Amino acid sequence: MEMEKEFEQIDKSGSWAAIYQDIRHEASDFPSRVAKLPKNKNRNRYRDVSPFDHSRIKLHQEDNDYINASLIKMEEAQRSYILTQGPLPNTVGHFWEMVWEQKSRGVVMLNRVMEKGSLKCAQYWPQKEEKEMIFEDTNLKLTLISEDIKSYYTVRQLELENLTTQETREILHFHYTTWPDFGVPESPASFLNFLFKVRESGSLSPEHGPVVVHCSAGIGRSGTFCLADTCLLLMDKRKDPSSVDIKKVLLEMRKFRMGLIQTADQLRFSYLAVIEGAKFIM
Ligand SMILES: Cn1ncc(Cl)c1C(=O)N1CCCCC1
Ligand SMILES: Cn1ncc(Cl)c1C(=O)N1CCCCC1
Numbered sequence: 001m002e003m004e005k006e007f008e009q010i011d012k013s014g015s016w017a018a019i020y021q022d023i024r025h026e027a028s029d030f031p032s033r034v035a036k037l038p039k040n041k042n043r044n045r046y047r048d049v050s051p052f053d054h055s056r057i058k059l060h061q062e063d064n065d066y067i068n069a070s071l072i073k074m075e076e077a078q079r080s081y082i083l084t085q086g087p088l089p090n091t092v093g094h095f096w097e098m099v100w101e102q103k104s105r106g107v108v109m110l111n112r113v114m115e116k117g118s119l120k121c122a123q124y125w126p127q128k129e130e131k132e133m134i135f136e137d138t139n140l141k142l143t144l145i146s147e148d149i150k151s152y153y154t155v156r157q158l159e160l161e162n163l164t165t166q167e168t169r170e171i172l173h174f175h176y177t178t179w180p181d182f183g184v185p186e187s188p189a190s191f192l193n194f195l196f197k198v199r200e201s202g203s204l205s206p207e208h209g210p211v212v213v214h215c216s217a218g219i220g221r222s223g224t225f226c227l228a229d230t231c232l233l234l235m236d237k238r239k240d241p242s243s244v245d246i247k248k249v250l251l252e253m254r255k256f257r258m259g260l261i262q263t264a265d266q267l268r269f270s271y272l273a274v275i276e277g278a279k280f281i282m
Helices: 004-014 017-027 038-044 092-101 189-200 222-239 244-253 265-279
Strands: 056-058 064-073 078-086 106-109 133-135 140-149 154-160 167-176 211-213
Touching: 004 017, 004 265, 017 222, 017 244, 017 265, 038 064, 064 133, 064 244, 078 222, 092 133, 092 140, 092 154, 154 189, 167 244, 189 222, 189 244, 189 265, 222 244, 222 265, 244 265
Parallel strands: 078 211, 106 167, 106 211
Antiparallel strands: 056 064, 064 078, 133 140, 140 154, 154 167
């Protein structure tokens, strides 16, 4: 079926939970043996969210190459994304090592450091220009260059220096700051505006390594971001845009990381975002 009318048909019939459970039943199951090794317990935020072995990002290190991060490679859309958990106190150095090694231009953050009164990720970037951060375990230096605070999101320019080679690179930090502590946003308008700002920066384009996107577990809000981006790109590429099937795209992405889209409300919000976004593109 088309999307907008499939949408109203699920609303009128109140069957979002049944649709979402079908997706959960059909989703791929692949091994994640490296994630579960005892030496990696303090590298995982949640025991039930792990990268598959076949798609995990490897650190260029011979001691321990593990990080909780996955490469989502979308062949028809010609887009790739790295989805990862919010960094932990003992993985902030690994996080920036990955950004460096994978040649990423942008980092997309969809959570606040504290939500619901608890810490959802480490404070992994500097908050003042004159107070830079040094990660001694991976030999990197990170400096805040500029910050632009808007009503729904903040954009930061960061300098990452590989202290071993003295090479430097400019990284863009796109921080969506207004996702509610509970539920999903009422309108997709500010989320779509944010997606378009990431796109306009070059961070999603083939001349760079894959964008790094995270929330707390790296599957819920993060899944919504890449699912909406890929669906809108396919609607632009194809002769028949009504042939884009958001459930089929989501199942394709779940071949590369488990659990993408965590609730039926997140599924409905993803439909809404693609539907509204397709009208603005034209
Ligand atoms: C300021 N700083 N220098 C190195 C690192 Cl790592 C940090 C940092 O962000 N943290 C928070 C997590 C554990 C303690 C340190
Ligand atoms: C997709 N989009 N781009 C900008 C804005 Cl604003 C929105 C949006 O959600 N709305 C509501 C529906 C009609 C268009 C306005």
